[PDB]
Write a protein that binds this ligand. Structure first.
Ligand SMILES: Nc1ncnc2c1ncn2[C@@H]1O[C@H](COP(=O)(O)OP(=O)(O)OP(O)(O)=S)[C@@H](O)[C@H]1O
Ligand SMILES: [Cl-]
Ligand SMILES: [Cl-]
Ligand SMILES: [Cl-]
Ligand SMILES: [Cl-]
Ligand SMILES: [Cl-]
Ligand SMILES: [K+]
Ligand SMILES: [Mg+2]
Length: 313
């Protein structure tokens, strides 16, 4: 039963299906509290901003969620838990565009309020807590299915190389679609490591970073699109954390942009959420995301995620 931070993912002791109820009760008496926290966040948001239409729309969904959830009777038996899963599925789907919506509604309205680092704390705080929720929720639902090397959304023997490769193809295509080509990606270091880990966070961060790296390479090699420098990913696996370094030769982050690439909405393009979102996720989970810019050569991005709750290897 691994946690992070005030949340916990249960290791299912199957049989009677008892865990299903233990987990469901937990989930059922967690989501609401947390949703409530988000409602306070909307309530304290600057008036000008909170007044924007889509910000209101999201604000409304959140209240609705709190209500539907609150109106759900306490889980007593399987049939309850089961219908709960139906509700959780629904909310999740209802809130699938929340991030886009926020990005949109907030883009204009933030250039109005007094405190600038204020919008950031809100986004940091809202997006992370959402990740936490969807994890907790997807995990519970997951405890119903039975995939191999998985207990909920917790993979028991995750391969960094494999998951890195999944998103490489994903991004390579996206890139190839836009430029007619994409950089090859070489992976080195602990390429055979396998350990318990939760792919979700990686499923959001890796593609964002690969996208950045690949776009950078192409926009900096407009004369030889058919031949661009490789992206090199290095996996470092130790007892404390998993470190994934993504090095490109795409010209780096200009000195003039360094202090901005981490701000929500900043972008030299694709609304500028990739980096600030990924950093929040990493830190939320107990890791970090750091940049090393070599202006004129390329960038090195270091993703660091902590291990389960043991010294994985
Ligand atoms: N590897 C990189 N090399 C060069 N510049 C980069 C790199 N990664 C990010 N940047 C710059 O930092 C800015 C912020 O990037 P992100 O926050 O990832 O947003 P974005 O890529 O503009 O848009 P999204 O992620 O698709 S919304 C980018 O617009 C680039 O100017
Ligand atoms: Cl929360
Ligand atoms: Cl309201
Ligand atoms: Cl009730
Ligand atoms: Cl792209
Ligand atoms: Cl090695
Ligand atoms: K940005
Ligand atoms: Mg990006």
């Amino acid at each position: 039963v691994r946690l992070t931070p005030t949340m916990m993912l249960y290791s299912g002791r199957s049989q009677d299906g008892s865990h299903l109820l233990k987990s469901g009760r937990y989930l059922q008496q967690e989501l609401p509290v947390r949703i409530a926290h988000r409602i306070k966040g909307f309530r304290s948001l600057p008036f000008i901003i909170g007044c924007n239409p889509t910000i209101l729309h999201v604000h409304e969904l959140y209240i609705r969620a709190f209500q539907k959830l609150t109106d759900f009777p306490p889980i007593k038996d399987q049939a309850d838990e089961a219908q709960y899963c139906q509700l959780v599925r629904q909310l999740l789907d209802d809130h699938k565009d929340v991030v886009t919506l926020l990005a949109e509604g907030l883009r204009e309205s933030r250039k109005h309020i007094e405190d600038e680092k204020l919008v950031r704390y809100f986004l940091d705080k809202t997006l992370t807590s959402r990740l936490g929720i969807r994890m907790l929720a997807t995990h519970h639902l997951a405890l119903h299915e039975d995939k191999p090397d998985f207990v909920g959304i917790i993979c028991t023997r995750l391969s960094p190389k494999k998951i890195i490769e999944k998103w490489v193809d994903f991004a390579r295509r996206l890139c190839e679609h836009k430029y007619g080509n994409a950089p090859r990606v070489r992976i080195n270091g602990h390429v055979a490591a396998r350990f318990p880990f939760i792919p979700m966070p990686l499923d959001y961060i890796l593609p964002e970073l690969l996208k950045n790296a690949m776009r950078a390479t192409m926009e900096s090699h407009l004369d030889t699109p058919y031949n661009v420098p490789d992206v090199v990913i290095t996996i470092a696996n130790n007892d404390v954390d998993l470190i994934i370094r993504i090095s490109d030769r795409g010209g780096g982050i200009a000195h003039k942009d360094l202090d901005r690439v981490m701000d929500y909405h900043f972008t030299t393009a694709g609304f500028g959420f990739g980096l600030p979102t990924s950093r929040a996720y990493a830190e939320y989970l107990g890791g970090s995301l750091q940049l090393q810019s070599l202006q004129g050569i390329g960038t090195d991005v270091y993703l660091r995620l902590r291990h389960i709750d043991g010294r994985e290897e």
